[PDB]
Design a protein around this ligand. Sequence first.
Ligand SMILES: CC(C)C[C@@]1(C)NC(=N)N(Cc2ccc(CNC(=O)Nc3ccc(C#N)cc3)cc2)C1=O
Length: 387
Amino acid sequence: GSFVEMVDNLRGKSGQGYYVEMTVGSPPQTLNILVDTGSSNFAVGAAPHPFLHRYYQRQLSSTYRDLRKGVYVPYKWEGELGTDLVSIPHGPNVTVRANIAAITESDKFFINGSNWEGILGLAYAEIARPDDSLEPFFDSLVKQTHVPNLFSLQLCGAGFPLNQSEVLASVGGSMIIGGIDHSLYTGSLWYTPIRREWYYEVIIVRVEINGQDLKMDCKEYNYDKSIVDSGTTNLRLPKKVFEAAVKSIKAASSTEKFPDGFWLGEQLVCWQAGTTPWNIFPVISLYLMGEVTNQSFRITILPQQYLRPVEDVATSQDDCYKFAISQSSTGTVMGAVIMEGFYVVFDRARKRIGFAVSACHVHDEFRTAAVEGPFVTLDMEDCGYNI
Ligand SMILES: CC(C)C[C@@]1(C)NC(=N)N(Cc2ccc(CNC(=O)Nc3ccc(C#N)cc3)cc2)C1=O
């Protein structure tokens, strides 16, 4: 591990998000900021809100610059554009002038108890609001400093519920800015092409549930796109792929009957402490296009990743979980529960995303997450969706 100053700089969890400490303004104002690879705006609460115990006060920053332009982001939050000096305490020792959207109005944006006050959009300018002329934070970082155009994320799910006091004292992972820290993963890193620079878009070419091919036209897996998004909790799958996957997951776990509410990801299921039947649930393998023609690799997740720990509505001693796979109408989304199994490298300089087994993924004595390759795969370019 060559980036010790950034290791363990994250806190949070899949459901409420993973955040990193940042400072904005002069003198520096400390804020917790959601790490989001699925958006491209650096935006912070800048006005009183029931869920914020602190917010960006522009009038107290001598380096604040008003852009005299509003921004509307409906998913929704509204803000005022400006720039100011930004730093990451547990990151590269550099200060950069970046665009900041001061959130003045928000609806269902801030999460009660998440402990974060802003969002750091790490994706490309093509999806930045109001438009692509608003330079994303990481772009500014790279243009103004010597920091390598690359970042890596190790999101660490605890494998069990973290109460309000525990999630504040618990290390939730690492965001390494400008490099790859080898202590964060085991085995080898496998790279899949970033198909286009807007979201971190990738191409899935094969899906297996316990080794069984889901056998769908691979274009279905990427309809209308597949992205890596730390701002989403679940593994989200296109409607038809979701239906086929759930059918297969139910078949594999048929020794136990689960209510429809469970499969809809709306209700928790509980087992007596320590007795969760991990082995009746199948592993899920996603094959990704490789860097070499006709070559792919696979990332395999365990039910310890797709079953999200939730505290029993009775706070009992039972181990309870919600099914963290849901349907999407916007393509495949590899959210935080999937990222928790892997050390993910966003190699912007080489337009590639790397995957390796996470040194902090949750597992059991019989199965482990995996990243394996290579596999002969033909016509992978046809798995990509075109409008
Ligand atoms: C691919 C992308 C364009 C879609 C998506 C989901 N991925 C993102 N990273 N963001 C950005 C994002 C990140 C984090 C938040 C945090 N607040 C929320 O979640 N509130 C919320 C609450 C309940 C529901 C529901 N029912 C929906 C949203 C909001 C937006 C998105 O909007």
